[PDB]
């Protein structure tokens, strides 16, 4: 009896030593959730850069990304688990406005995710994929955006914009598509979380530096808001 308590306490101390060692690793890594609206080249931008998991490291910082493919449900109940991630990566094909439409469904999904009761302090990194063929089909006159989005008729290119030798038409279309998401982002945001939109193509090779910078900005803004400085 007397020796049993001492022996049982010996195992507890050994276990507690390992728990402290594993806590340093847990707090030094950042968890990311990858959401796709369907198609949109989600796997292409992942390969170049049940549940599927991957790990990558940049500038001696550990990142660990999550992709869900085994739960194809219109209503997402498992979304409550990812309430402590650093950021959420949203991938949408900006060139699927004419195809039956997909852009409105993606916008509705973004609205549903943004206003969730549990994801109330999580920022979203937005990737607007498939820019080259978007520009090609905008240049081609066989399709028109106004035939699907009537609000595009009364839209003008912002003065505070940075075009890439680029046709003003494709620039106007790109900024209209981006502002469609930005309006929903700013409608309900109260400073607890923002959105970082990017224009992404197939030949891009710096998609990891963008994630690094966005995560750094997210953490810095969180600390600034916590210390009553923002």
């Amino acid at each position: 009896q007397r020796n049993e308590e001492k022996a049982q306490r010996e195992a507890n101390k050994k276990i507690e030593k390992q728990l402290q060692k594993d806590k340093q690793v847990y707090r030094a890594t950042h968890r990311l959730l990858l959401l796709g609206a369907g198609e949109s080249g989600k796997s292409t931008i992942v390969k170049q850069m049940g549940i599927f998991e991957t790990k990558f490291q940049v500038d001696k910082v550990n990142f660990h990304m999550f992709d869900v493919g085994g739960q194809r449900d219109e209503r997402r109940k498992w979304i409550q688990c990812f309430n402590d991630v650093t950021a959420i990566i949203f991938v949408v094909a900006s060139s699927s406005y004419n195809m039956v439409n997909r852009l409105q469904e993606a916008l509705n999904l973004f609205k549903s995710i943004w206003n969730n009761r549990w994801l109330r302090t999580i920022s979203v990194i937005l990737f607007l994929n498939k820019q080259d063929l978007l520009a090609e089909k905008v240049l081609a006159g066989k399709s028109k955006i106004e035939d699907y989005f009537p609000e595009f008729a009364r839209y003008t290119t912002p003065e505070d914009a940075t075009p890439e030798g680029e046709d003003p038409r494709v620039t106007r279309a790109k900024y209209f598509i981006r502002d469609e998401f930005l309006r929903i982002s700013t409608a309900s945001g109260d400073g607890r979380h923002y959105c970082y939109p990017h224009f992404t193509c197939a030949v891009d090779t710096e998609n990891i530096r963008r994630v690094f910078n966005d995560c750094r900005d997210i953490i810095q803004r969180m600390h600034l808001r916590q210390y009553e400085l923002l």
Partner: protein, 331 residues
């Protein structure tokens, strides 16, 4: 044609059970003296988990219990002396349920990887992996030392054979995701509550549905039999708990208040069945009188929402887990 008879059949059942209801449960139990004020105090506090706690299960000996956390550990505690016994690292960090075998020789696990893993505690290493579900697991309970029943998010439940790793039978009939299940004391029947606000009664031996109960209006999160075995209670995210009767095929009493609007995460009964313990999203827990539908106590002290709840077989203590990576024992 075929759908025409469905409307007639559904109305026949409703009128069949409408004549049975001659008096409410509350009407008969008006003359019972109230249980009074019930106050409980925390006896133990268990620390060591690095993330939120999603599941918990007591042992048959009423001394050891197991817990699961999102950081990827499966720790077995010693409630009497507050000493960790085991710590099993998990291959997948997303875990949603855990179970403890009646004989105390095995522990089950499962989550977002659609795989159920059985661990051997007296040898710790993985003993078997069960595959075949197309959705995330929600609950799992041990029928015996060689068979186990599980529920998942693909609207189906299955009974497995641990030795061969093959599904003996599959239960179908739900429309939404199945969220919980509970076994009968004799292990011959079990119930399940899904996201279509419906609960069904299944037969393990025959693999056929017996009855259906549809008194709720939102996704059901928890379920538990009465100790007698002829009734059960459910809890949804509309701030209501309801008691259903197997023999009468209808509900008997509802437990709700106007000052609460949050969801319900877990329910549990007591040794005699007179008390009903329910966890809420309001960071605390409530104690109800089963035969009167009035509050008798409040369990407060958790810093975040309570996700797990359990009562020992001998009924000496209550264990609650929450998202602040803490476990508490109440007596």
């Amino acid at each position: 044609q075929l759908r025409q008879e469905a409307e007639q059949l559904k109305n026949q059942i409703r009128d069949a059970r409408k004549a049975c209801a001659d008096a409410t449960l509350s009407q008969i139990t008006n003359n019972i003296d109230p249980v009074g004020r019930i106050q409980m105090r925390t006896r133990r506090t268990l620390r060591g988990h690095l993330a939120k706690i999603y599941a918990m299960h007591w042992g048959t000996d009423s001394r050891l219990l197991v817990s699961a956390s999102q950081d990827g550990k499966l720790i077995i505690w010693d409630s009497y002396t507050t000493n960790k016994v085991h710590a099993i690292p998990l291959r997948s960090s997303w875990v949603m349920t855990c179970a403890y075998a009646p004989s105390g020789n095995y522990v089950a696990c499962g989550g977002l990887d659609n795989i159920c893993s059985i661990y051997n505690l007296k040898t710790v290493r993985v003993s078997r992996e069960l595959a075949g579900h197309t959705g995330y697991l929600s609950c799992c309970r041990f029928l015996d030392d060689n068979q186990i029943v599980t529920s998942s998010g693909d609207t189906t439940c299955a009974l497995w054979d641990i030795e061969t790793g093959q599904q003996t039978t599959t239960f179908t009939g739900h429309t939404g995701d199945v969220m919980s299940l509970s076994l009968a004391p004799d292990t011959r029947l079990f119930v399940s509550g899904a996201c279509d606000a419906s609960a069904k009664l299944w037969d393990v031996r025959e693999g056929m549905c017996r009855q259906t109960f549809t008194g709720h209006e939102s996704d059901i999160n928890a379920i538990c039999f009465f100790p007698n075995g002829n009734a059960f209670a459910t809890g949804s995210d509309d701030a209501t708990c309801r008691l259903f009767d197997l023999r009468a095929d209808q509900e008997l009493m509802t437990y709700s208040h106007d000052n609460i609007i949050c969801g319900i995460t877990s329910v549990s009964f007591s040794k005699s069945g007179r008390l009903l313990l329910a966890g809420y999203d309001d960071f605390n827990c409530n104690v109800w009188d089963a035969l009167k539908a009035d509050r008798a106590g409040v369990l407060a002290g958790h810093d975040n929402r309570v996700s797990c709840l359990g009562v020992t077989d001998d009924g000496m203590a209550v264990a609650t887990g929450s998202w602040d990576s803490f476990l508490k024992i109440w007596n």
